[PDB]
Design a protein around this ligand. Structure first.
Ligand code: NAD
Ligand code: NAD
Ligand code: NAD
Ligand code: NAD
Lengths: 337, 339, 339, 337
């Protein structure tokens, strides 16, 4: 019922499209794809993925400006400047901004100009923009918002179970460190970058880089403003990452009580978002996981009764996409104009 | 004695500067770099390198555009358009074009227009106007007045040529194919993303990636006699540096044995190619060739003749260091043959 | 119908069980596994696999020695000495010896002594004892009463043989060399440590590692006509799975062109080798061949004839899955040719 | 002077030998090497290292039971059962137990039986054994101890700067997580192991495994008993690891004050052991680093005035070896009879 446009057919662009194809009766409907790459490029990479593996569906290069997916046809355009994209001409109701450049009022806006109605930024918003984390405050949304960000891959993980903690033990303060797979942003070989760390090897190092997810939590959980903050470590893995939260709560608590709380929420309210896992697994064992966050129960540990540490896995690509879709899935509902 | 500029401060360019520093007493003298990132981004990466390791020497940031390697200053500018470069102002004699963009006559020449005397491309020329040299093979063929734009060939071609010569020049190469298990490179995607070559667009780090390569044909450019007889592909494998070539040319001569083919190398190795070729009999692995000054190293124990006529060789070469070292020899030449 | 045991629950053995599960209706029936680790260690690894990904089906631990894949039980024992195995007690008809230790007549046969009817080695024999089969090539040559111990050859040999045949059988193979850029394997060290082969003793994950391979010679074992004509090395590269072969045999026939050589495959591909060979024209990379049921896939765009007589081919094969899939076909045979 | 025997010529065995060769006027003297591998194996791998790179020295296979290093000759034997090794015959005063098996009273002892005088275990000791961490309590040593452990690669990092914290701000409680390079212990490909995590891919995952360094700290810093505890993450890197400590101190403090303290100690008492680094680097940039621990200043951050997080790099192989040598270097001094 809701016409969608994917701008920035990159990792989240494709991880999304596919995430979508798997949903049943989706209020969303992709019709146009805009990426610097030609129809060839869009086809190939939607079909052959080095992380999600070959796509189970018939994907051919139907057209000079389109591609086919199981028959459903989609147009592929390519303008490095949004304003030009025929969003208005095609009556684009929603745009999934996954390019990594248009993250600000000014930028994301060029989509509105092109005739688009709304712009969902597949990343944290820069400046004054509505940030929502499905499961943490999607009710805050209102069809009034023309530009929203679905936060970061990290925040979307850390948030859900932080809510659970604070909302039960009261987070006083706490740091966190996310051992994260690398991303398109890193340099494959020591090359220039504005982050001399991210500028390094990527596949040969543990690259400490900074992350906003720290303060971004507060963005969606107003209560924790200035109580959280952490860094991140980019390790040699193409996907799936883990967060190492460490909060100090008021209400003295113990190991299994914490985990318990998590499970409870994971079975009720956060069912579909959060989840626990006792089976001692590892990164790779968490590919294609529809949930945003997954607690590694056996790792959770408490100190001096009030210092809680929680490890949590999450597929920074898929799981996020599934959220992106779930958010857009929402915009389609509670949509009046 | 001769002022040198380095256009493109990445791997090969930086590998250059390093090569040059710790040297006998090169007539060369790097006085300027063109890294689109400033003294910061250009310094840091010269000091800390993931593949060569922390550079051994005081590298400080003087001025806002003038770092220094042990006191010796190096002015650093930045601009994508060579035309705006101060080559003339500074009086640049040689320019090491290591960007992989300016590889045609019109392009690389933009440096001359800026005020450069001579230009060396650290890659194969796209023109036909430009001479391709390969120290060890046909370096003599270079003499002042003869073209002010030369190409030090390819990393692969500079590893092949040398021992390809000794093969034909002392056994006669009928013709043959070749492959090269090559360490991934900057032109590859880190993760599956758009790229003009749907092979290079795949995670450089998690795939064996087949990609065309002229390095084979270009051998001729230095060894005419072979023109249109060699050829092959290349395979990118998750290894940041150091690669190997797999040559399979069925010889013309008799039907010699294995270990004698070797001896030819061994002979031509400590002789005319002392510094270029070499043969390592001890069974090692890629990582053992990091920082190898030899343009090519044959794995003795790997060589093997099949049907008397078909010979098969395997060579080891550090694509970053090795090439860069030759590029300093080829720039070392220019200066030794200068008025 | 036919009861099967799996001695060695590692990669190939587990890759087996997996292959077998999701199948048409194999006459085979795995009823026991010999993993020196119990139901725990044996279950976990069947459910969660770093290279195949979480196994799609309810796998629970019944008894203290009897897990179950979707209800169907599988008794699990453990002992390094086959002699102590309950093969007879359980009445095991076929044993998939996938340990890489028992590969000689005396050894693999210890399973018969325990009460096994027939033994299939998932690797090349330990000597001149036992036949070597390669589905697609000479599977017919197997008939009951003819030896109760067979070898499904090598992962490489099972990738080569097939398309090696079509080459000689429709172009005549004079002789040639070959190389194989191969995904590292369990027999390699994780980090530089003691190992009988100073090449495999090096960090499997950070080196291109040259190591001998008989896979080349053994082709003869199934294709006698070539006996002593092929040969080559192998290169281990940081890639957990999926490998490629680089065959270079100068043909006997005329001096055919590239794309026609291909057509032969393409022809013999959808014909006699429908399920074994195949040709992929679309430029992909290793990772795109994960879970490939074809024993060999040729990269169309990579094939290339040089001097009319010298042909060069490149094939893609998943060393884990593919082989394991043949191993289930070769065990599928035994049953279809059983009293 | 002091005759030494290296048992377990593995990574720490060799990283040690070499660490030694570089020292000037070393009270230590290696004379025999025992490893399951033949003279070939010992030679090659001492010369060609995939992590330290080719060894700068002439290393030939002199003998049927010996190898030569710059002339200094060394015997190479091979008995999987210590008791047999001719420690007594060669008058072995010290044995560097780096095999990973003989970590207990019973085991390490077999060396004493063979005629050896002392046994330095290049790992944490199992049970009741003297544990010393050069820089944290080496004065506790006395020639009386016949069997000592030089703790783990992690503890040897975490300890030094923990002492600095407590000894200045008072550690109340705190967890830690060490993003660690992989080791010989992990499986190269999903294979059996007693730790179904360590049993996984190793090079394709972030493998959560447990570490003792948590409680082991207390072993050498009696004061922190039961105040520290953490896990570890095995990421795809052959060497150099980083620790992410998170302690809550009593004395309210701020970012730069902490770092300062570190530097002060690093320039005085811990000079040679601890050290700080402001230049934003990455893993690889810390190979061959003679110090046990290196603080990444720019990363250190405080919360709510009492929750301190400190990141610290360390070469789990080299840096440790240098410690092992420094410990044995000590046994040679303060050695009576
Ligand atoms: N993958 C993750 O872990 C993850 C998850 C959450 C957030 N994010 C953020 O989402 C953003 C999207 O990046 P990605 O993960 O999709 O990877 P990516 O970098 O591959 O995606 C960017 C894509 O957009 C295209 N593009 C850039 N500018 C364009 C323009 N003007 N017009 C059209 N196409 C254009 C690029 O060619 C590229 O294909 C990044 O900023 C990333 O940090 C990433
Ligand atoms: N070291 C190696 O791996 C290696 C091997 C042999 C040869 N080469 C060749 O050297 C060339 C350089 O590529 P690289 O591998 O060093 O990659 P790189 O990206 O590390 O180096 C490119 C450098 O050139 C600069 N640059 C790019 N475009 C520019 C422009 N228009 N104006 C000015 N500076 C510009 C970049 O900022 C960077 O500093 C390539 O053609 C490559 O094939 C490299
Ligand atoms: N997976 C592949 O890539 C591949 C390719 C083709 C063939 N193979 C062949 O498969 C064989 C097995 O190697 P792998 O890769 O499966 O290694 P692996 O170590 O993963 O498997 C070995 C298994 O055998 C068991 N085992 C070992 N010794 C035993 C003994 N004495 N008695 C009983 N069980 C014993 C081990 O417990 C383990 O379960 C090798 O010969 C290899 O060449 C493997
Ligand atoms: N590398 C690190 O990060 C690190 C640092 C601190 C602690 N350690 C400790 O170092 C020790 C050695 O492990 P490593 O890292 O050197 O790996 P490793 O597995 O390479 O070292 C073990 C070596 O001991 C040899 N060995 C085994 N049993 C033997 C015996 N009975 N007699 C003689 N030699 C025998 C093996 O052949 C092998 O070469 C272990 O105790 C480990 O806990 C490791």
């Amino acid at each position: 019922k809701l016409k969608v446009a994917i701008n920035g057919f990159g990792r989240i662009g494709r991880n999304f499209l596919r995430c979508w194809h798997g949903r049943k009766d989706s209020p969303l409907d992709v019709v146009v794809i805009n990426d610097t790459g030609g129809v060839k490029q869009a086809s190939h990479l939607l079909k052959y993925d080095s992380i999600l593996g070959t796509f189970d569906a018939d994907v051919k290069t139907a057209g000079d400006s389109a591609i086919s997916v199981d028959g459903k046809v989609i147009k592929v355009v390519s303008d490095r400047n949004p304003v030009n994209l025929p969003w208005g001409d095609m009556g684009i109701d929603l745009v999934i901004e996954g390019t990594g450049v248009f993250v600000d009022r000014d930028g994301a806006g060029k989509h509105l100009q092109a005739g688009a109605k709304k712009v969902l930024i597949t990343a944290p918003g820069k400046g004054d923009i509505p940030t929502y984390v499905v499961g943490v405050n999607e009710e805050g949304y209102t069809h009034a918002d023309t530009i929203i960000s679905n936060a970061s891959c990290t925040t979307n993980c850390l948030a859900p179970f932080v809510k659970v903690l604070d909302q039960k033990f009261g987070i006083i303060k706490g740091t966190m460190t996310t051992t994260h797979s690398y991303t398109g942003d890193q340099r494959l070989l020591d090359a220039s970058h504005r982050d001399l760390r991210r500028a390094r090897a990527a596949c040969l190092n543990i690259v400490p880089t900074s992350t906003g997810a720290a303060k971004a939590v507060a963005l969606v959980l107003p209560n924790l403003k200035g109580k959280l903050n952490g860094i991140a470590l980019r390790v040699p893995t193409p996907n799936v990452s883990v967060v190492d939260l460490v909060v100090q709560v008021s209400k003295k608590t113990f190991a299994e009580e914490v985990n318990a709380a998590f499970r409870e929420s994971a079975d009720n309210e956060l069912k579909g978002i959060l989840s626990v896992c006792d089976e001692p697994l590892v990164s790779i064992d968490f590919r294609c996981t529809d949930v945003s966050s997954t607690i590694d129960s056996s790792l959770t540990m408490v100190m001096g009764d009030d210092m809680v540490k929680v490890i949590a896995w999450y597929d920074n690509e898929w799981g996020y996409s599934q959220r992106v879709v779930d958010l857009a899935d929402i915009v389609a509902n509670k949509w009046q104009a | 004695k001769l002022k040198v500029a380095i256009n493109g401060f990445g791997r090969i360019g930086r590998n250059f500067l390093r090569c040059w520093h710790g040297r006998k007493d090169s007539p060369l003298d790097v006085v300027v770099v063109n890294d689109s990132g400033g003294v910061k981004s250009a310094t840091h990466l010269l000091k800390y390198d993931s593949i060569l390791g922390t550079f051994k020497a005081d590298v400080k940031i003087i001025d806002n555009e003038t770092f220094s390697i042990d006191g010796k200053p190096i002015k650093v500018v930045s601009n994508r358009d060579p035309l705006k470069l101060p080559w003339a102002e500074l009086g640049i004699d040689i320019v090491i074009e290591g960007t992989g963009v300016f590889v045609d006559g019109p392009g690389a020449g933009k440096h001359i227009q800026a005020g450069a005397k001579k230009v060396i491309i650290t890659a194969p020329a796209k023109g036909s106007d430009i001479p391709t040299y390969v120290v060890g093979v046909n370096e003599k063929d270079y003499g002042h007045d003869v073209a002010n734009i030369i190409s030090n060939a390819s990393c692969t071609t500079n590893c092949l040529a040398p021992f390809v010569k000794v093969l034909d020049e002392e056994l006669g190469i009928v013709k043959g194919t070749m492959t090269t298990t090559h360490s991934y490179t900057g032109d590859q995607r880190l993760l599956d993303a758009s790229h003009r070559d749907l092979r290079r667009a795949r995670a450089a780090a998690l795939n064996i990636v087949p990609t065309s390569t002229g390095a084979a044909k270009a051998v001729s450019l230095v060894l005419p006699q072979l023109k249109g007889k060699l050829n092959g592909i290349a395979l990118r494998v998750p290894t940041p540096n150091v690669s190997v070539v797999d040559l399979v040319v069925n010889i013309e001569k008799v039907g010699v044995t294995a270990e004698d083919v070797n001896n030819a190398f061994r002979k031509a190795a400590a002789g005319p190619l002392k510094g270029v070729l070499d043969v390592c009999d001890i069974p090692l692995v890629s990582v053992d060739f990091r920082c190898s000054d030899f343009s090519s190293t044959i794995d003795s124990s790997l060589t093997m003749v099949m049907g008397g006529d078909m010979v098969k060789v395997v060579a080891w070469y550090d694509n970053e260091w090795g090439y860069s070292q030759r590029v300093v020899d080829l720039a070392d030449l220019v200066a030794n043959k200068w008025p």
